[PDB]
Design an enzyme around this catalytic site. Structure first.
Site, PDB file in Angstrom:
ATOM      1  N   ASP A 101      37.250  44.967  29.102  1.00 53.23           N
ATOM      2  CA  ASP A 101      38.430  45.825  29.299  1.00 53.23           C
ATOM      3  C   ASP A 101      38.068  47.219  29.793  1.00 53.23           C
ATOM      4  OD1 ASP A 101      40.218  43.801  28.655  1.00 53.23           O
ATOM      5  OD2 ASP A 101      40.496  44.437  26.598  1.00 53.23           O
ATOM      6  N   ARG A 105      52.292  49.726  32.321  1.00 56.10           N
ATOM      7  CA  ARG A 105      51.380  49.047  33.237  1.00 56.10           C
ATOM      8  C   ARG A 105      50.212  49.994  33.432  1.00 56.10           C
ATOM      9  NH1 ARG A 105      52.967  47.125  39.389  1.00 56.10           N
ATOM     10  NH2 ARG A 105      50.934  46.215  39.988  1.00 56.10           N
ATOM     11  N   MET A 106      49.008  49.538  33.078  1.00 55.93           N
ATOM     12  CA  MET A 106      47.835  50.424  33.021  1.00 55.93           C
ATOM     13  C   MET A 106      47.485  51.079  34.343  1.00 55.93           C
ATOM     14  SD  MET A 106      45.192  49.078  30.184  1.00 55.93           S
ATOM     15  CE  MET A 106      44.981  47.341  30.483  1.00 55.93           C
ATOM     16  N   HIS A 112      46.132  32.502  42.473  1.00 57.52           N
ATOM     17  CA  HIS A 112      45.301  32.114  41.340  1.00 57.52           C
ATOM     18  C   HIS A 112      45.423  30.663  40.908  1.00 57.52           C
ATOM     19  CE1 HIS A 112      42.983  35.547  40.200  1.00 57.52           C
ATOM     20  NE2 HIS A 112      44.028  36.323  39.976  1.00 57.52           N
ATOM     21  N   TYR A 116      38.150  43.114  42.889  1.00 60.02           N
ATOM     22  CA  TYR A 116      39.246  42.784  43.795  1.00 60.02           C
ATOM     23  C   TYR A 116      38.891  43.174  45.246  1.00 60.02           C
ATOM     24  CZ  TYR A 116      42.202  42.286  39.587  1.00 60.02           C
ATOM     25  OH  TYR A 116      42.741  41.889  38.355  1.00 60.02           O
ATOM     26  N   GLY A 137      50.595  41.500  36.896  1.00 64.58           N
ATOM     27  CA  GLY A 137      50.833  40.073  36.796  1.00 64.58           C
ATOM     28  C   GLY A 137      49.705  39.421  36.009  1.00 64.58           C
ATOM     29  N   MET A 138      49.898  38.173  35.600  1.00 65.73           N
ATOM     30  CA  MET A 138      48.863  37.404  34.923  1.00 65.73           C
ATOM     31  C   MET A 138      49.144  35.947  35.252  1.00 65.73           C
ATOM     32  SD  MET A 138      46.250  37.038  33.157  1.00 65.73           S
ATOM     33  CE  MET A 138      45.422  35.449  33.090  1.00 65.73           C
ATOM     34  N   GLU A 139      48.148  35.289  35.840  1.00 62.47           N
ATOM     35  CA  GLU A 139      48.324  33.955  36.428  1.00 62.47           C
ATOM     36  C   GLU A 139      48.315  32.795  35.393  1.00 62.47           C
ATOM     37  OE1 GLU A 139      45.634  36.043  36.702  1.00 62.47           O
ATOM     38  OE2 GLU A 139      43.783  34.866  36.614  1.00 62.47           O
TER      39      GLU A 139
HETATM   40  O1  LIG Z   1      45.965  38.296  38.445  1.00 60.38           O
HETATM   41  C1  LIG Z   1      45.481  39.416  38.223  1.00 60.38           C
HETATM   42  O2  LIG Z   1      44.446  39.902  38.750  1.00 60.38           O
HETATM   43  C2  LIG Z   1      46.272  40.303  37.283  1.00 60.38           C
HETATM   44  C3  LIG Z   1      45.409  41.403  36.666  1.00 60.38           C
HETATM   45  C4  LIG Z   1      44.496  40.783  35.634  1.00 60.38           C
HETATM   46  N1  LIG Z   1      45.038  41.143  34.328  1.00 60.38           N
HETATM   47  C5  LIG Z   1      46.065  40.181  33.897  1.00 60.38           C
HETATM   48  C6  LIG Z   1      46.035  40.304  32.392  1.00 60.38           C
HETATM   49  C7  LIG Z   1      44.557  40.368  32.097  1.00 60.38           C
HETATM   50  C8  LIG Z   1      44.025  41.222  33.239  1.00 60.38           C
HETATM   51  C9  LIG Z   1      42.622  40.790  33.654  1.00 60.38           C
HETATM   52  O3  LIG Z   1      41.946  41.154  32.462  1.00 60.38           O
HETATM   53  C10 LIG Z   1      40.592  41.258  32.564  1.00 60.38           C
HETATM   54  C11 LIG Z   1      39.849  40.538  33.510  1.00 60.38           C
HETATM   55  C12 LIG Z   1      38.447  40.673  33.573  1.00 60.38           C
HETATM   56  C13 LIG Z   1      37.813  41.548  32.679  1.00 60.38           C
HETATM   57  O4  LIG Z   1      36.469  41.697  32.659  1.00 60.38           O
HETATM   58  C14 LIG Z   1      35.840  42.123  33.768  1.00 60.38           C
HETATM   59  C15 LIG Z   1      36.121  43.387  34.311  1.00 60.38           C
HETATM   60  C16 LIG Z   1      35.444  43.797  35.452  1.00 60.38           C
HETATM   61  C17 LIG Z   1      34.501  42.937  36.002  1.00 60.38           C
HETATM   62 CL1  LIG Z   1      33.666  43.404  37.411  1.00 60.38          CL
HETATM   63  C18 LIG Z   1      34.214  41.694  35.461  1.00 60.38           C
HETATM   64  C19 LIG Z   1      34.896  41.276  34.326  1.00 60.38           C
HETATM   65  C20 LIG Z   1      38.550  42.250  31.736  1.00 60.38           C
HETATM   66  C21 LIG Z   1      39.938  42.110  31.663  1.00 60.38           C
HETATM   67 ZN   LIG Z   2      44.023  38.386  40.075  1.00 57.33          ZN
END
Ligand SMILES: O=C([O-])CCCN1CCC[C@H]1COc1ccc(Oc2ccc(Cl)cc2)cc1
Ligand SMILES: [Zn+2]
Ligand SMILES: [Yb+3]
Ligand SMILES: [Yb+3]
Ligand SMILES: [Yb+3]
Length: 607
Positions: A372, A560-561, A296, A380, A266-268
């Site tokens: 990334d 989905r990764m 979110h 989380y 998902g992506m908020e």
């Molecule tokens: O709502 C959600 O958590 C859905 C999963 C999050 N997804 C939705 C599409 C983008 C992705 C989040 O993408 C990120 C978010 C944070 C990112 O950088 C970090 C990665 C790890 C840490 Cl400990 C801190 C920053 C790198 C990529």
């Molecule tokens: Zn989230």
């Protein structure tokens, strides 16, 4: 200081508004147009500013109706290239001006996936979707690419007239395009200030169905009915989330079910959550993802991490709210089951990275790290673990939810650090400071590995999963006959999943056990993506050759990764499937999501 951004920081100048006018060119795989940024100086005598860009072609920069000087710096890897703009007149503090930048994206934009008609459901039209988080917005348009800055926006998007554009904003009508009658212009307004990672765009042959008083589901026609049913709990989850977090401020809460290559669950995106079609289990069992994206709307979109080092603020709080929503819907025992599940996922992550790895820290240092590459379950689940531990320490779920709501109220529309959070926590629980001082903060926030303290978890719903998993693990050949389809009689889908998760932690098992598990439980028939994922990983790690084409198929038919990355890794570690995995990746690479392609490549040590 946001170490992931090359732009002028928020202490120097701040973007207040973006007006985006652009046209989506499917023939060239480019987005072309103008980003007009309303920028407010935070300094006296400001004469230039720097923006983030990545693989952008800049045609011109206009201020006050005249073209101005700008220069693109040298590329700094995954951060892209800084764009310095020479202001025509020096600005005093708080003075605003509008800077209009004419630009074009690269087909290779790491923000974007361009899909051919064959990669869609309908097979007759192409499709585009964006994903800006964390730092890919600069690969769509020049901006201060940092969540430390929040801006409102409006957009006009020109697309082929048979297609529909949607954005993370309120739909503001549509018209034929005055320049080209084969095209439509879709208009959008986002009146709540947002960090730029929440800018989102999709264009495709989309249809919509209403499922609640403020929610339409959008997807291609062939997924609409299924999606409407799958996500029918949405409104009731919004009402609980509002109870816990305060008013929902975004107007609409729509859902968009993306094609299978969407890289995440998902992506908020505000007003329009994006979800993977792998949620379409048929029984609403994977709806915690909706609960999470809903959450979110408060923790992340209202209260935002100031830099990516503080990403756990976004995710820990959101998982915390998520689990409360599901606890209201299905019981406190279910909240504990999911929480205990999450701890298991945290064990897995720490073991995978190693217990001294810097990415197992709650607060990370992302200087020279591609976010990334750092992304994992750690922010989380270690973030959730901390909040859950605090909840228990400070007197229970209802006391701690008082704090969460006060936290959201306090920092709404702001971007904050871990220190801001900790400070407010101490302020709010002033009468319980002595208890707060017992917390080992330096360990919780800054040390690698599992947290120093594990919370207390109700085990009721987990016990049967553990008992069944242990029977299998301790079984010898002569015990295999005793297993039977009735073993699964009283297990929900979630318990089935946890059973597999427990067993997977001790993988490999003997091949004969796994063959028997298929014989009696027929896991090959289950289409629930979460269950199927763990079962296939268990098969491949236990060296079952029959599972190879199934694992390859799942790894590639969706993107989905969470599923694709470990399936490719498992397949590469199995000597029997290693060459197939590498070959399948190589043949699929060009049509994969650009981020997914990069990370799978790295995982596999390819290209
Ligand atoms: O709502 C959600 O958590 C859905 C999963 C999050 N997804 C939705 C599409 C983008 C992705 C989040 O993408 C990120 C978010 C944070 C990112 O950088 C970090 C990665 C790890 C840490 Cl400990 C801190 C920053 C790198 C990529
Ligand atoms: Zn989230
Ligand atoms: Yb309007
Ligand atoms: Yb025996
Ligand atoms: Yb090579």
């Amino acid at each position: 200081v946001d170490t992931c951004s090359l732009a002028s920081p928020a202490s120097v100048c701040r973007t207040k508004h973006l007006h985006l006018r652009c046209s989506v060119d499917f023939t060239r795989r480019t987005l072309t147009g103008t980003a007009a940024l309303t920028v407010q100086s935070q300094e006296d005598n400001l004469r230039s500013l720097v923006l983030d860009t990545k693989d952008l072609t800049i045609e011109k920069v206009v201020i006050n109706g005249q073209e101005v000087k700008y220069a693109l710096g040298e590329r700094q890897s995954y951060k892209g290239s800084p764009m310095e703009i020479s202001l025509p007149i020096a600005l005093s503090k708080n003075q605003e001006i509008v800077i209009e930048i004419s630009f074009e994206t690269s087909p290779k934009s790491s923000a974007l996936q361009w899909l051919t008609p064959e990669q869609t459901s309908g097979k007759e039209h192409p499709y585009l979707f964006s994903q800006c988080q964390a730092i890919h917005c600069r690969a769509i348009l020049p901006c201060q690419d940092t969540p430390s800055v929040k801006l409102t926006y409006t957009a006009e998007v020109s697309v082929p007239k048979e297609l529909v554009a949607l954005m993370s904003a309120i739909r503001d009508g549509e018209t034929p395009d005055p320049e080209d009658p084969s095209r439509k212009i879709y208009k959008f307004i986002q009146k709540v200030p947002i960090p730029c990672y929440l800018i989102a765009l999709v264009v495709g042959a989309l249809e919509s169905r209403q499922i609640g008083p403020r929610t339409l589901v959008w997807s291609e026609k062939e997924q609409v009915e299924k999606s409407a049913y799958e996500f029918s709990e949405t409104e009731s989850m919004l009402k609980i989330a509002e109870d816990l977090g305060g008013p929902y401020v975004w107007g609409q809460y729509d859902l968009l079910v993306l094609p299978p290559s969407f890289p995440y669950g998902g992506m908020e995106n505000p007003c329009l959550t994006f979800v993977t079609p792998t949620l379409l289990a048929g029984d609403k069992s994977l709806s915690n993802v909706i609960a999470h994206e809903i959450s979110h709307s408060w923790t992340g979109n209202l209260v935002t991490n100031k830099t990516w080092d503080h990403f756990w603020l976004n995710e820990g709080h959101t998982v915390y709210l998520e689990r409360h929503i599901c606890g209201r819907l299905f019981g406190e025992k279910f909240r504990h089951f999911n929480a205990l599940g999450g701890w298991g996922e945290l064990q897995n992550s720490v073991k995978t990275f190693g217990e001294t790895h810097p990415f197992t820290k709650l607060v990370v240092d992302l200087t020279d790290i591609d976010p990334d590459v750092a992304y994992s379950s750690v922010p989380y689940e270690k973030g959730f673990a901390l909040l859950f531990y605090l909840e228990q320490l400070l007197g229970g779920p209802e006391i701690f939810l008082g704090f969460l709501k006060a936290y959201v109220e306090k920092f709404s529309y702001k971007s904050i650090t871990t220190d801001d959070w900790k400070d407010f926590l101490y302020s709010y629980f002033k009468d319980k400071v002595d208890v707060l001082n017992q917390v080992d903060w330096n360990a919780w926030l800054y040390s690698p590995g599992l947290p120093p303290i594990k919370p207390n978890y109700d085990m009721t719903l987990t016990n049967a999963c553990i008992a069944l998993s242990q029977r299998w693990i301790t079984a010898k050949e002569d015990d295999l006959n005793s297993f039977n389809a009735t073993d699964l009689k009283d297990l929900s889908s979630h318990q089935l999943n946890e059973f597999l998760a427990q067993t997977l932690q001790r993988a490999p098992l003997p091949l004969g056990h796994i063959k028997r598990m298929q014989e009696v439980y027929n896991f090959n028939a289950i289409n629930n993506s979460e269950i199927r994922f763990r079962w296939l990983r268990l098969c491949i790690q236990s060296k079952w050759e029959d599972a190879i084409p199934l694992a390859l198929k799942m790894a590639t038919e969706q993107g989905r990764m969470k599923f694709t990355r470990p399936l490719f890794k498992d397949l590469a570690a199995f000597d029997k499937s290693h060459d197939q995995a590498v070959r399948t990746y190589q043949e699929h690479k060009a049509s994969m999501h650009p981020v997914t392609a990069m990370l799978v490549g790295k995982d596999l040590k390819v290209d």
